[PDB]
Amino acid sequence: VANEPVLAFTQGSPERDALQKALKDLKGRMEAIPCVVGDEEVWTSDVQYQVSPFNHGHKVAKFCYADKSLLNKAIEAALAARKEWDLKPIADRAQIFLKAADMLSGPRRAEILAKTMVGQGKTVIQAEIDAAAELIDFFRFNAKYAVELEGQQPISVPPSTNSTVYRGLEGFVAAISPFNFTAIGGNLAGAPALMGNVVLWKPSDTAMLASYAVYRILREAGLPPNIIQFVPADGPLFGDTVTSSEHLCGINFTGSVPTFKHLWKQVAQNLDRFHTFPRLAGECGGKNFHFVHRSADVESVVSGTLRSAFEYGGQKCSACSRLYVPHSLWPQIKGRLLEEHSRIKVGDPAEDFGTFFSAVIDAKSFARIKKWLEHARSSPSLTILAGGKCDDSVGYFVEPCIVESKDPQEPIMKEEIFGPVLSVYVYPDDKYKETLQLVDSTTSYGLTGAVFSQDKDVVQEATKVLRNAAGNFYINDKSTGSIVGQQPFGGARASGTNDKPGGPHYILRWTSPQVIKETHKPLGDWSYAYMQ
Amino acid sequence: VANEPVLAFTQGSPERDALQKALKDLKGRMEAIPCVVGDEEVWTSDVQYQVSPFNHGHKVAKFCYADKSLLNKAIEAALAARKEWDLKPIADRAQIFLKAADMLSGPRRAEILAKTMVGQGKTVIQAEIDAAAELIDFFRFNAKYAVELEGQQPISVPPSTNSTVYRGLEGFVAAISPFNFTAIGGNLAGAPALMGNVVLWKPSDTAMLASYAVYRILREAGLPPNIIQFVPADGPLFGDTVTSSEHLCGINFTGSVPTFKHLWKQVAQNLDRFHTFPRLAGECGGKNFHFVHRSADVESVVSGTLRSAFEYGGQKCSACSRLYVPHSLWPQIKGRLLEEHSRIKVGDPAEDFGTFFSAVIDAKSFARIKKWLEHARSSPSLTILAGGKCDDSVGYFVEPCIVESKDPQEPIMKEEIFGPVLSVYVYPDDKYKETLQLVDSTTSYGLTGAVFSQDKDVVQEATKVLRNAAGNFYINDKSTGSIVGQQPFGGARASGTNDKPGGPHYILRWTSPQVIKETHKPLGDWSYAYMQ
Ligand SMILES: O=P(O)(O)Oc1c2c(c(O)c3c1[C@H]1C[C@@H]3c3cc4c(cc31)[C@H]1C[C@@H]4c3ccccc31)[C@H]1C[C@@H]2c2cc3c(cc21)[C@H]1C[C@@H]3c2ccccc21
């Protein structure tokens, strides 16, 4: 298996024509997305709408929230399907995901990209690397890893034969996916299902349109009923309900630190009722760095930092939000960042393929980011160098913002904003070693980080100092854009449990192996020779 | 790597003479075992004694409980040693464990066996398969698996080089080991240390002599100071102290389900203070079955069941405590079980090598078993077929006991006794399929189980029905005695987290990987061609 090729979308290309046609097919249209339990389309009275972030007057989907009753019905029906699905050979379960991957690659590529663009506000290329490439790669690579895992078998010595059976977990898994990557929903529900689990999938409200498209592709690729239940819901009620079920065996979560910790506390509070110990997997965010040494390639620093900080509006757990620059290069880097900043286009990504990034996802995010832009004006240690405006009249539009902090410990250097807000700290060149320690100590997070240096001694030094500051560490590249099979993704500290989805070990969280020993000769006496 | 050969200890063998000399060397002697922080031997006033279970007048060791101050000092010192240990190449960490394995195999074998016999009440062969064979195997196999893991590396695609660094966990690990296997303490503390972690090891009070011998061998094999701190303590105080530390990164536990669930709840209660999400690993109890089909080899049922139920007094999480026999074979199996029962010798294992098993571990365990034996003689559905008496006047001596239940759901069929008490349910031959379901549905546990059948269709059928009733499932063999590398050990339901120590994946719980991407060419423009 190889990584899915990323298409260029050149003027006149078939993929660009297909994508423009799929975008035109969504304009002025709304889909009614039901909850799905088995093959039943279920509607509750608690109706919700998804809107286009860059045109929030456009309702792109109507959906509804599952309540406690419907969620418990979905649990019961999933559990009643699990034994059969777990006994289905892994090669057969894998084939469904490989067929879904082929559909996303070819005939459904334009649709899944367009729904991710219109529903989540992604540009062409951000939709392509997510909803096509990453999702396709998770499905094909996890399928490869799961079939290869069957070959990891114990030793046999006469008179016995040993084997390992890679059972799914007994119970159901709750998959809770974020707004910002179509692919992550596919993986959070898909990887456990591949390993013989049954799943209640609560997709993100602001990603409904594309998340349901992923669900329908999996069902059309042959996923049986009751293996993944499609159950949008209020976050607290979903959490309360799954953590109250005696049958919970896992939570596969991506999102905020506090929500993950809350779910962990709810499981522990109910620990005496579960039939087994639930497995919690959480990817929980970052306050990621780009650290520049005075020997750096300045144009690589500028391009890589502008992409890491501002693509998809900085709405990535991997996005650079703290830049460390030596005094000697600062005038040059500042000049270049301010030059390029003025050439960044923010607008409608469906209508204008010149757009670098579009609106942030929703009103709540827009209000949080606006509070940070107010903080950057109201704080004595902060100076806005570029941007600072926002406008919610049409979409949730925030200009890319570059903020200089005179204080390396300022809250803007520590708290995850999840918006297009880059904080810069200028350090004395002769204090680069002290500044590496500041990079390591300043925040609670451990997710991504980059060092830009042509000086290999500084790279070797920075690599050692920052060993636990970043689970995905980059040398002379940007902190975003991990590729399945190339950079397995995750980190520790407050960033989560670090199960490295995108690598071969992630699937091991979703199997509880059994070992069988068969003895081929009679056993003989209970006593031992030495006892006689 | 091969499994350590199990020696026979027959009259005239070198290992029988060497063991008798080592036993002689312990008779009427006591060791003063300190807490060890770094290389410092530390005493508190909270002195404790380990006694021989078969002769509870004989103190074999004096030790002491670490107080809160000493545990906190142990944590700080371990943390200060962690970075250099984590950076030591895995080949160099492994060589320490391989040297320890060589010492245990050769010059320290008789000592570690004799300390396990006198201190924990094991017979020769139970000491040999534990303190020698299984511990040596853990050390050699985990070393092999850790060096193999290093070779699991991601795909590099120009212009970038990718690598995985198998970092130890950032923080300290608490290892909490049980009385019943010397080897398990070695693995619980040793496997995390192999993977670049630092450890506070709280060994079991009633295994202190042999646990300290393991610790000293590791230090003499080259383990640096402050990698494993030897800190016997009160169980509750140890748990409180380590779960209150913001630096806790893991608990490696073997013991009771209530203690494991308490620790899990304490970690969740403190989750906001930890620098990262602690990893909890728990092996707990079983209520393990031997299921007999009417086609079974009766003599293999009899010998396998007597060994599984009664070796080491049934003090194994894997021990058979429920036997399911078809009516057509019951007169035969009952007669053979009662004849062999009468031939079982219980006595002093050091003085009489004819002993099948000796006293149970301590007064608390004796009292629990005596309470169950009272239940067995005072319950409407139960009858005692053999045994039923106990005597604590010299040692904690319990006769092997066979109980028949007419009720397959009786408490004695469900609850883990951890003593030499076998419960038998006789089922109608034509209800063998309903009885397979009862095996699966009766208890809360999922650890070990066996089917005895020469009918290969019934073996297939039982394998499917009992898929989640046992994590270690045996076909025509007894339910105890897993061998490292051959039967990776563990199970789910209430039996724990099922991380399969003894197999290749267990060490993955003790690493938090980092992935490095190094890009060798400049990054180019931040814009994309399709945007022009
Ligand atoms: O249930 P209680 O503890 O109020 O009373 C005693 C009983 C009995 C008994 O011998 C005692 C008690 C009191 C006095 C004696 C005893 C002995 C003990 C304890 C309480 C009691 C504490 C310390 C010791 C013990 C062992 C295991 C769990 C709890 C304890 C009989 C009669 C009764 C009893 C209950 C049971 C059983 C047997 C009995 C079985 C099935 C159930 C049980 C629980 C835990 C282990 C074993 C059993």
PDB file of C-alpha atoms in Angstrom, chain A residues 187-403:
ATOM      1  CA  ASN A 187     -10.615   6.933  11.677  1.00  0.00           C
ATOM      2  CA  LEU A 188     -12.111   7.288  15.204  1.00  0.00           C
ATOM      3  CA  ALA A 189     -15.158   5.183  14.228  1.00  0.00           C
ATOM      4  CA  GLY A 190     -13.464   3.151  11.446  1.00  0.00           C
ATOM      5  CA  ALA A 191     -10.298   1.873  13.157  1.00  0.00           C
ATOM      6  CA  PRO A 192     -12.207   0.256  16.091  1.00  0.00           C
ATOM      7  CA  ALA A 193     -14.821  -1.160  13.671  1.00  0.00           C
ATOM      8  CA  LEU A 194     -12.039  -2.661  11.489  1.00  0.00           C
ATOM      9  CA  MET A 195     -10.725  -4.488  14.601  1.00  0.00           C
ATOM     10  CA  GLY A 196     -14.102  -6.185  15.236  1.00  0.00           C
ATOM     11  CA  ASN A 197     -15.710  -3.538  17.468  1.00  0.00           C
ATOM     12  CA  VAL A 198     -19.142  -1.932  17.297  1.00  0.00           C
ATOM     13  CA  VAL A 199     -19.322   1.829  17.569  1.00  0.00           C
ATOM     14  CA  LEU A 200     -21.668   4.667  18.481  1.00  0.00           C
ATOM     15  CA  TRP A 201     -20.293   7.564  16.394  1.00  0.00           C
ATOM     16  CA  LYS A 202     -21.196  11.083  17.571  1.00  0.00           C
ATOM     17  CA  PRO A 203     -19.899  13.299  14.731  1.00  0.00           C
ATOM     18  CA  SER A 204     -19.267  17.029  15.222  1.00  0.00           C
ATOM     19  CA  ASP A 205     -22.322  19.235  14.562  1.00  0.00           C
ATOM     20  CA  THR A 206     -20.279  21.643  12.382  1.00  0.00           C
ATOM     21  CA  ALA A 207     -18.941  18.740  10.225  1.00  0.00           C
ATOM     22  CA  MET A 208     -22.276  16.839   9.797  1.00  0.00           C
ATOM     23  CA  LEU A 209     -22.583  17.009   5.979  1.00  0.00           C
ATOM     24  CA  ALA A 210     -19.149  15.505   5.262  1.00  0.00           C
ATOM     25  CA  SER A 211     -19.282  13.103   8.249  1.00  0.00           C
ATOM     26  CA  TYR A 212     -22.580  11.583   6.996  1.00  0.00           C
ATOM     27  CA  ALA A 213     -21.027  11.263   3.513  1.00  0.00           C
ATOM     28  CA  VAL A 214     -18.207   9.185   5.082  1.00  0.00           C
ATOM     29  CA  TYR A 215     -20.821   7.075   6.923  1.00  0.00           C
ATOM     30  CA  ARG A 216     -22.850   6.442   3.735  1.00  0.00           C
ATOM     31  CA  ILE A 217     -19.684   5.498   1.749  1.00  0.00           C
ATOM     32  CA  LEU A 218     -18.821   2.923   4.460  1.00  0.00           C
ATOM     33  CA  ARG A 219     -22.357   1.469   4.351  1.00  0.00           C
ATOM     34  CA  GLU A 220     -22.320   1.362   0.499  1.00  0.00           C
ATOM     35  CA  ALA A 221     -18.860  -0.326   0.647  1.00  0.00           C
ATOM     36  CA  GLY A 222     -20.572  -3.146   2.582  1.00  0.00           C
ATOM     37  CA  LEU A 223     -20.376  -2.250   6.267  1.00  0.00           C
ATOM     38  CA  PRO A 224     -23.175  -4.326   7.903  1.00  0.00           C
ATOM     39  CA  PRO A 225     -25.933  -2.713   9.927  1.00  0.00           C
ATOM     40  CA  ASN A 226     -25.350  -1.968  13.632  1.00  0.00           C
ATOM     41  CA  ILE A 227     -21.514  -1.887  13.340  1.00  0.00           C
ATOM     42  CA  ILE A 228     -21.355   1.937  13.299  1.00  0.00           C
ATOM     43  CA  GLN A 229     -24.424   3.770  14.597  1.00  0.00           C
ATOM     44  CA  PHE A 230     -24.608   7.359  13.291  1.00  0.00           C
ATOM     45  CA  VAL A 231     -25.779   9.302  16.394  1.00  0.00           C
ATOM     46  CA  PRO A 232     -25.288  13.042  16.505  1.00  0.00           C
ATOM     47  CA  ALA A 233     -26.153  14.279  20.000  1.00  0.00           C
ATOM     48  CA  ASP A 234     -25.543  16.970  22.596  1.00  0.00           C
ATOM     49  CA  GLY A 235     -22.002  16.409  23.852  1.00  0.00           C
ATOM     50  CA  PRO A 236     -22.828  16.224  27.590  1.00  0.00           C
ATOM     51  CA  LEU A 237     -25.831  13.924  27.132  1.00  0.00           C
ATOM     52  CA  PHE A 238     -23.865  11.631  24.780  1.00  0.00           C
ATOM     53  CA  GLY A 239     -21.012  11.442  27.329  1.00  0.00           C
ATOM     54  CA  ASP A 240     -23.406  10.882  30.260  1.00  0.00           C
ATOM     55  CA  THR A 241     -25.205   8.117  28.405  1.00  0.00           C
ATOM     56  CA  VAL A 242     -22.209   6.118  27.098  1.00  0.00           C
ATOM     57  CA  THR A 243     -20.288   6.413  30.432  1.00  0.00           C
ATOM     58  CA  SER A 244     -23.464   5.177  32.284  1.00  0.00           C
ATOM     59  CA  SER A 245     -23.648   1.995  30.089  1.00  0.00           C
ATOM     60  CA  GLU A 246     -22.295  -1.253  31.734  1.00  0.00           C
ATOM     61  CA  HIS A 247     -21.328  -2.238  28.142  1.00  0.00           C
ATOM     62  CA  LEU A 248     -18.881   0.633  27.398  1.00  0.00           C
ATOM     63  CA  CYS A 249     -15.488  -0.826  26.433  1.00  0.00           C
ATOM     64  CA  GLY A 250     -13.790   2.213  24.874  1.00  0.00           C
ATOM     65  CA  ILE A 251     -13.921   5.900  24.033  1.00  0.00           C
ATOM     66  CA  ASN A 252     -12.081   7.169  20.935  1.00  0.00           C
ATOM     67  CA  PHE A 253     -11.986  10.945  21.318  1.00  0.00           C
ATOM     68  CA  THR A 254     -10.461  13.959  19.598  1.00  0.00           C
ATOM     69  CA  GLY A 255     -11.140  17.467  20.889  1.00  0.00           C
ATOM     70  CA  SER A 256     -10.504  19.532  24.036  1.00  0.00           C
ATOM     71  CA  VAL A 257      -8.489  18.554  27.180  1.00  0.00           C
ATOM     72  CA  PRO A 258     -11.381  19.340  29.583  1.00  0.00           C
ATOM     73  CA  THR A 259     -13.931  17.215  27.685  1.00  0.00           C
ATOM     74  CA  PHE A 260     -11.565  14.209  27.599  1.00  0.00           C
ATOM     75  CA  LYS A 261     -10.726  14.603  31.323  1.00  0.00           C
ATOM     76  CA  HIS A 262     -14.457  14.873  32.108  1.00  0.00           C
ATOM     77  CA  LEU A 263     -15.202  11.624  30.235  1.00  0.00           C
ATOM     78  CA  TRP A 264     -12.253   9.929  32.012  1.00  0.00           C
ATOM     79  CA  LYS A 265     -13.671  11.045  35.401  1.00  0.00           C
ATOM     80  CA  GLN A 266     -17.172   9.804  34.444  1.00  0.00           C
ATOM     81  CA  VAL A 267     -15.799   6.357  33.535  1.00  0.00           C
ATOM     82  CA  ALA A 268     -13.832   6.176  36.796  1.00  0.00           C
ATOM     83  CA  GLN A 269     -16.915   7.238  38.830  1.00  0.00           C
ATOM     84  CA  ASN A 270     -18.900   4.344  37.228  1.00  0.00           C
ATOM     85  CA  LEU A 271     -16.018   1.857  37.187  1.00  0.00           C
ATOM     86  CA  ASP A 272     -17.787  -0.756  39.390  1.00  0.00           C
ATOM     87  CA  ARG A 273     -20.656  -1.192  36.865  1.00  0.00           C
ATOM     88  CA  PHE A 274     -18.701  -1.920  33.671  1.00  0.00           C
ATOM     89  CA  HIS A 275     -18.271  -5.554  32.562  1.00  0.00           C
ATOM     90  CA  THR A 276     -14.648  -4.678  31.632  1.00  0.00           C
ATOM     91  CA  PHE A 277     -12.159  -1.825  31.993  1.00  0.00           C
ATOM     92  CA  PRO A 278     -12.916   0.756  29.275  1.00  0.00           C
ATOM     93  CA  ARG A 279     -10.023   1.945  27.098  1.00  0.00           C
ATOM     94  CA  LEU A 280      -9.881   5.734  26.661  1.00  0.00           C
ATOM     95  CA  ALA A 281      -7.952   7.190  23.728  1.00  0.00           C
ATOM     96  CA  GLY A 282      -7.751  10.993  23.503  1.00  0.00           C
ATOM     97  CA  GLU A 283      -6.053  13.438  21.104  1.00  0.00           C
ATOM     98  CA  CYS A 284      -6.457  16.754  23.144  1.00  0.00           C
ATOM     99  CA  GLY A 285      -4.613  19.658  21.350  1.00  0.00           C
ATOM    100  CA  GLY A 286      -1.348  21.625  21.467  1.00  0.00           C
ATOM    101  CA  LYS A 287       0.397  24.935  21.842  1.00  0.00           C
ATOM    102  CA  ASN A 288       2.906  24.179  19.138  1.00  0.00           C
ATOM    103  CA  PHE A 289       6.203  25.927  18.458  1.00  0.00           C
ATOM    104  CA  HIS A 290       8.491  26.911  15.589  1.00  0.00           C
ATOM    105  CA  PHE A 291      11.952  27.576  17.063  1.00  0.00           C
ATOM    106  CA  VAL A 292      14.395  29.470  14.767  1.00  0.00           C
ATOM    107  CA  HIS A 293      18.176  29.402  15.138  1.00  0.00           C
ATOM    108  CA  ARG A 294      20.189  32.301  13.615  1.00  0.00           C
ATOM    109  CA  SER A 295      21.559  29.777  10.952  1.00  0.00           C
ATOM    110  CA  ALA A 296      17.997  29.085   9.584  1.00  0.00           C
ATOM    111  CA  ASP A 297      16.882  29.319   5.929  1.00  0.00           C
ATOM    112  CA  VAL A 298      14.745  32.479   6.374  1.00  0.00           C
ATOM    113  CA  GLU A 299      12.384  31.812   3.397  1.00  0.00           C
ATOM    114  CA  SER A 300      11.653  28.257   4.730  1.00  0.00           C
ATOM    115  CA  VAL A 301      10.903  29.816   8.173  1.00  0.00           C
ATOM    116  CA  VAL A 302       8.538  32.344   6.570  1.00  0.00           C
ATOM    117  CA  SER A 303       6.635  29.896   4.266  1.00  0.00           C
ATOM    118  CA  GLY A 304       6.483  27.093   6.823  1.00  0.00           C
ATOM    119  CA  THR A 305       5.312  29.395   9.657  1.00  0.00           C
ATOM    120  CA  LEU A 306       2.635  31.134   7.541  1.00  0.00           C
ATOM    121  CA  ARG A 307       1.240  27.702   6.478  1.00  0.00           C
ATOM    122  CA  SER A 308       1.470  26.128   9.974  1.00  0.00           C
ATOM    123  CA  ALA A 309      -0.084  29.178  11.734  1.00  0.00           C
ATOM    124  CA  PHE A 310      -2.810  30.145   9.244  1.00  0.00           C
ATOM    125  CA  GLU A 311      -3.904  27.222   7.018  1.00  0.00           C
ATOM    126  CA  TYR A 312      -7.498  26.338   7.837  1.00  0.00           C
ATOM    127  CA  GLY A 313      -7.475  29.462  10.036  1.00  0.00           C
ATOM    128  CA  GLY A 314      -5.041  27.799  12.484  1.00  0.00           C
ATOM    129  CA  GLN A 315      -7.845  25.343  13.422  1.00  0.00           C
ATOM    130  CA  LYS A 316      -5.494  22.383  13.876  1.00  0.00           C
ATOM    131  CA  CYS A 317      -4.183  20.741  17.036  1.00  0.00           C
ATOM    132  CA  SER A 318      -0.746  20.795  15.197  1.00  0.00           C
ATOM    133  CA  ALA A 319      -0.788  24.512  14.143  1.00  0.00           C
ATOM    134  CA  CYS A 320       2.180  26.725  15.067  1.00  0.00           C
ATOM    135  CA  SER A 321       0.982  29.357  17.566  1.00  0.00           C
ATOM    136  CA  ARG A 322       4.374  30.314  19.119  1.00  0.00           C
ATOM    137  CA  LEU A 323       7.344  31.445  17.026  1.00  0.00           C
ATOM    138  CA  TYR A 324      10.775  31.927  18.690  1.00  0.00           C
ATOM    139  CA  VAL A 325      13.103  34.205  16.657  1.00  0.00           C
ATOM    140  CA  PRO A 326      16.689  35.316  17.446  1.00  0.00           C
ATOM    141  CA  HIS A 327      17.186  39.139  17.708  1.00  0.00           C
ATOM    142  CA  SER A 328      19.763  39.031  14.820  1.00  0.00           C
ATOM    143  CA  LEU A 329      17.201  37.630  12.240  1.00  0.00           C
ATOM    144  CA  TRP A 330      14.107  39.418  13.642  1.00  0.00           C
ATOM    145  CA  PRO A 331      14.138  42.562  11.420  1.00  0.00           C
ATOM    146  CA  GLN A 332      14.508  40.332   8.293  1.00  0.00           C
ATOM    147  CA  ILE A 333      11.854  37.754   9.424  1.00  0.00           C
ATOM    148  CA  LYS A 334       9.439  40.481  10.636  1.00  0.00           C
ATOM    149  CA  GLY A 335       9.759  42.318   7.261  1.00  0.00           C
ATOM    150  CA  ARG A 336       9.083  39.118   5.263  1.00  0.00           C
ATOM    151  CA  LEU A 337       6.171  37.983   7.500  1.00  0.00           C
ATOM    152  CA  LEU A 338       4.546  41.438   7.177  1.00  0.00           C
ATOM    153  CA  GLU A 339       5.129  41.496   3.333  1.00  0.00           C
ATOM    154  CA  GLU A 340       3.586  38.035   2.851  1.00  0.00           C
ATOM    155  CA  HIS A 341       0.750  38.725   5.374  1.00  0.00           C
ATOM    156  CA  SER A 342      -0.559  41.526   3.070  1.00  0.00           C
ATOM    157  CA  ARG A 343      -0.776  38.919   0.174  1.00  0.00           C
ATOM    158  CA  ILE A 344      -2.927  36.424   2.184  1.00  0.00           C
ATOM    159  CA  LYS A 345      -6.485  36.342   0.787  1.00  0.00           C
ATOM    160  CA  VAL A 346      -9.306  35.440   3.227  1.00  0.00           C
ATOM    161  CA  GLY A 347     -12.703  34.772   1.631  1.00  0.00           C
ATOM    162  CA  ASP A 348     -15.195  32.268   0.183  1.00  0.00           C
ATOM    163  CA  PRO A 349     -13.229  29.099  -0.678  1.00  0.00           C
ATOM    164  CA  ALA A 350     -15.936  27.702  -2.996  1.00  0.00           C
ATOM    165  CA  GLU A 351     -16.275  30.933  -5.043  1.00  0.00           C
ATOM    166  CA  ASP A 352     -12.603  32.042  -4.966  1.00  0.00           C
ATOM    167  CA  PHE A 353      -9.848  29.403  -5.313  1.00  0.00           C
ATOM    168  CA  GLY A 354      -7.372  32.265  -4.643  1.00  0.00           C
ATOM    169  CA  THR A 355      -8.438  32.068  -0.927  1.00  0.00           C
ATOM    170  CA  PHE A 356      -5.583  31.019   1.388  1.00  0.00           C
ATOM    171  CA  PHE A 357      -8.000  30.298   4.260  1.00  0.00           C
ATOM    172  CA  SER A 358     -11.615  31.107   5.084  1.00  0.00           C
ATOM    173  CA  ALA A 359     -13.871  31.782   8.092  1.00  0.00           C
ATOM    174  CA  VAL A 360     -13.439  29.937  11.396  1.00  0.00           C
ATOM    175  CA  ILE A 361     -15.956  27.222  12.127  1.00  0.00           C
ATOM    176  CA  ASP A 362     -18.725  28.820  14.233  1.00  0.00           C
ATOM    177  CA  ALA A 363     -19.938  31.700  16.433  1.00  0.00           C
ATOM    178  CA  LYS A 364     -18.522  30.240  19.670  1.00  0.00           C
ATOM    179  CA  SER A 365     -15.035  29.971  18.120  1.00  0.00           C
ATOM    180  CA  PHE A 366     -15.337  33.473  16.603  1.00  0.00           C
ATOM    181  CA  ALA A 367     -16.228  34.870  20.081  1.00  0.00           C
ATOM    182  CA  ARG A 368     -13.230  33.092  21.749  1.00  0.00           C
ATOM    183  CA  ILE A 369     -10.822  34.366  19.084  1.00  0.00           C
ATOM    184  CA  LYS A 370     -12.291  37.925  19.302  1.00  0.00           C
ATOM    185  CA  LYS A 371     -11.591  37.816  23.105  1.00  0.00           C
ATOM    186  CA  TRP A 372      -7.895  36.928  22.311  1.00  0.00           C
ATOM    187  CA  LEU A 373      -7.637  39.796  19.754  1.00  0.00           C
ATOM    188  CA  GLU A 374      -9.090  42.151  22.476  1.00  0.00           C
ATOM    189  CA  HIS A 375      -6.477  40.678  24.941  1.00  0.00           C
ATOM    190  CA  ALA A 376      -3.670  41.420  22.386  1.00  0.00           C
ATOM    191  CA  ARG A 377      -4.818  45.129  22.377  1.00  0.00           C
ATOM    192  CA  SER A 378      -5.425  45.305  26.206  1.00  0.00           C
ATOM    193  CA  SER A 379      -2.093  43.719  27.431  1.00  0.00           C
ATOM    194  CA  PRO A 380       1.146  45.680  28.032  1.00  0.00           C
ATOM    195  CA  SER A 381       3.499  42.860  26.843  1.00  0.00           C
ATOM    196  CA  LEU A 382       1.640  42.349  23.483  1.00  0.00           C
ATOM    197  CA  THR A 383       1.780  44.282  20.174  1.00  0.00           C
ATOM    198  CA  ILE A 384      -0.353  43.365  17.120  1.00  0.00           C
ATOM    199  CA  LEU A 385       2.091  43.522  14.158  1.00  0.00           C
ATOM    200  CA  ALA A 386      -0.460  42.497  11.449  1.00  0.00           C
ATOM    201  CA  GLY A 387      -4.216  41.754  11.304  1.00  0.00           C
ATOM    202  CA  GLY A 388      -6.386  42.104  14.424  1.00  0.00           C
ATOM    203  CA  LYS A 389      -9.788  42.593  12.737  1.00  0.00           C
ATOM    204  CA  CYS A 390     -12.749  40.212  12.589  1.00  0.00           C
ATOM    205  CA  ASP A 391     -16.202  40.490  10.952  1.00  0.00           C
ATOM    206  CA  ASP A 392     -19.139  38.057  11.513  1.00  0.00           C
ATOM    207  CA  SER A 393     -21.656  39.901   9.219  1.00  0.00           C
ATOM    208  CA  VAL A 394     -21.529  37.224   6.422  1.00  0.00           C
ATOM    209  CA  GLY A 395     -19.219  34.456   7.726  1.00  0.00           C
ATOM    210  CA  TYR A 396     -17.082  33.955  10.859  1.00  0.00           C
ATOM    211  CA  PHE A 397     -14.174  35.859   9.253  1.00  0.00           C
ATOM    212  CA  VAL A 398     -10.949  36.540  11.237  1.00  0.00           C
ATOM    213  CA  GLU A 399      -7.902  38.169   9.625  1.00  0.00           C
ATOM    214  CA  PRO A 400      -4.589  36.336  10.109  1.00  0.00           C
ATOM    215  CA  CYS A 401      -3.026  38.005  13.173  1.00  0.00           C
ATOM    216  CA  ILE A 402       0.656  38.257  14.199  1.00  0.00           C
ATOM    217  CA  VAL A 403       1.221  39.335  17.826  1.00  0.00           C
TER     218      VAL A 403
END
